[PDB]
Amino acid sequence: TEGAKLFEKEIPYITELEGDVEGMKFIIKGEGTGDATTGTIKAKYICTTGDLPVPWATILSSLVFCFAKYPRHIADFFKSTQPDGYSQDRIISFDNDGQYDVKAKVTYENGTLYNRVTVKGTGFKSNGNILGMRVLYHSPPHAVYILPDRKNGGMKIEYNKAFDVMGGGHQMARHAQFNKPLGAWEEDYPLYHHLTVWTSFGKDPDDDETDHLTIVEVIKAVDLETYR
């Protein structure tokens, strides 16, 4: 309950990502806002090391479920664990291709929400859509499984992303994720539920210098009784 109060208004949202895909190192810095009242995330991410050496769409999920619109009756792991924060680690397996090993800490610090994340990409194929830069510049809407996992002291998160590729066709990205509190948590495990995500990609028209991504994104918790 205490943690959720921190999100009752729009607050700043900062992302720092350090990536290494097949030895190609990159840094992404994001600046934006998250508004958990409406589930609305807005941000601009800049690759501060130069050009991003993988498609932007494939790195979006690495770059804050704490901003999801939650109803009062579903236990909200992502806010409940604040301000100490939570760990969010995942393996993103790209079908017919390599994987991103992603490790993050998501923490509230003096009024701003931070996502600090490392990405290690291995196993990628030279003829694939990721190294080949053939994943189109958008991220379609998705549904995310949020599963209680008391046995491992946290939440098991499982979902697919279905990207569009040049020439038609798709690139599936299988996300196997685990979340754990970093500090205090009253251990109010949510029931199995979903999140929905919708995203719009853009560019900053005033920025002709950097390789960057702007987003407007909406994330919402879904009570599965609505499926009945």
Describe the overall structure.
- This protein has helices spanning 2-5, 56-59, 77-80; strands spanning 11-21, 24-35, 40-47, 86-94, 99-109, 112-122, 142-149, 154-164, 170-181, 193-202, 212-222.
- With 228 residues, the protein is mainly beta.
- The chain is built from three helices and eleven strands.
- The two termini are 28 Å apart.
- 5% of the residues lie in helices and 50% in strands.
- The relative contact order is 0.21.
- It has an eleven-stranded mixed β-barrel.
List descriptors:
Green Fluorescent Protein, Fluorescent protein, mainly beta, luminescent protein
SS field, number of helical segments: 3
Distance between the termini: 28 Å
Query: Helix coverage percent of residues?
Result: under 10%
> Strand arrangement, largest sheet?
1-2-3-11-10-7-8-9-4-5-6
Using the coordinates above, name the CATH class. Mainly Beta
Radius of gyration: 17 Å
Silhouette:
globular
Which series of helices and strands comes N to C? HEEEHHEEEEEEEE
Largest sheet: 11 strands, mixed, barrel
Sheet/helix structural class:
mainly beta
Number of domains: 1
PDB class: luminescent protein
Keywords: Fluorescent protein, GFP, Structural Genomics, PSI, Protein Structure Initiative, Southeast Collaboratory for Structural Genomics, secsg, luminescent protein
Assembly: monomeric
Entry title: Green fluorescent protein from Clytia gregaria
